[PDB]
């Protein structure tokens, strides 16, 4: 069994010449040479079977990624595991190799307006498909946007994804959430479980703002500090937007704050395209009911050079204990086995 930085990374004779790429969620990511297709590929190692939550997220992602087929969503090319449930300890998922990701790119490279436009188009085109399947990604952020050497973009990491459930979205104030802090919509901290498509649009808005300046727009240091940052830029919500928050703890928290003026987008982003800032404003709307939807964002003047709904496909249908989850992961990966 081949080893990378101390641990087994045992991907049969098909995949050879491994190089470390970085850490994943339940194991490391390597590139390898695929001896069948004659290309380097990415392989992530997953060791989820001790835990309910790890099994859950591994299984959720495999089921989603095998059902989805879209140019802006990372696919699964192969899955490696032992031939029996008893022998199966790790699972390896083989995917297209992508040079970089948007997090790495933003740390090192200024983006032209033409690159920002293209990246945002491809994000929204992929998101149209995800939302058309009644699925929410729920952790969109730069590190989850893979890019290749020609700037093709693919959304990855469906481990926090959920089927949309707007009728069960309401919750109380300061209810814990799992998804990445800087890209969390204000309502998560106020009255939302993150069960609507509007959650993902907020994240895309944050990504757009970050593409404009190379800096996260709302770099909170902790749960309610995230809301401090958002209100610092958007300013105090209007009476109408406040009246939408029926929960009294959440409403009265907002009422307790001193008045904060909106910071104009063109003062934060003096070099940005004005059409990009109009779209940014519509994605970073406080009230999730007023927030632009993915198909409307694609139709925004900023993206007019690329917008083509006939070339922005949708999904053919809506998407629908640890021992049982190991069995389910085993059954779900069976199609990749020899015989
Ligand atoms: C969402 C990215 S990851 O954490 O799953 N790691 C990863 C997957 C697939 C890739 N293809 N090229 C690079 C990577 C990284």
From Swiss-Prot:
Phenotype when changing residue 308 to N: In NS13; results in increased MAPK signaling; increased translocation to the nucleus; reduced interaction with DUSP6; no effect on interaction with MAP2K1
Binding site for ATP: 21-29, 44
Effect of residue 224 to A: Inhibits interaction with TPR
Keyword match Hydrolase: no
Catalysed transformations (reactions): L-seryl-[protein] + ATP = O-phospho-L-seryl-[protein] + ADP + H(+); L-threonyl-[protein] + ATP = O-phospho-L-threonyl-[protein] + ADP + H(+)
Gene3D superfamilies: Phosphorylase Kinase, domain 1 (3.30.200.20), Transferase(Phosphotransferase) domain 1 (1.10.510.10)
This protein's name: Mitogen-activated protein kinase 1
Upper lineage: Eukaryota, Metazoa, Chordata, Craniata, Vertebrata
